[PDB]
Point group: D2
């Protein structure tokens, strides 16, 4: 899985880069 | 992101297939 | 990268499953 | 598939970034 480790807040996966997922702490990972 | 539509429980991401991740509700997605 | 190893002929990546790519021998990989 | 738009030569897939693969023409893609 490709998820650059850029710190980004999110509500949905579409708020995230690449194949990062929106995790339960409100950040992409 | 490639995450099969297979119902799987998980404690860690490693429990999941492909690029699915372990969500805190206790299932892969 | 997620590429199921199902034998499939191709001309383009869109002929392939998942994140398989169309390789120079004419099969997905 | 996540393959950065970065010009890279390669002898093997391992030479490439992310989910890029080594094409026989000698570049990642
Ligand atoms: Zn991927």
């Amino acid at each position: 899985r490709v998820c650059p480790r850029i710190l980004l807040e999110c509500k949905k996966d579409s708020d995230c880069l690449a194949e990062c997922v929106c995790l339960e702490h409100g950040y992409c990972g």
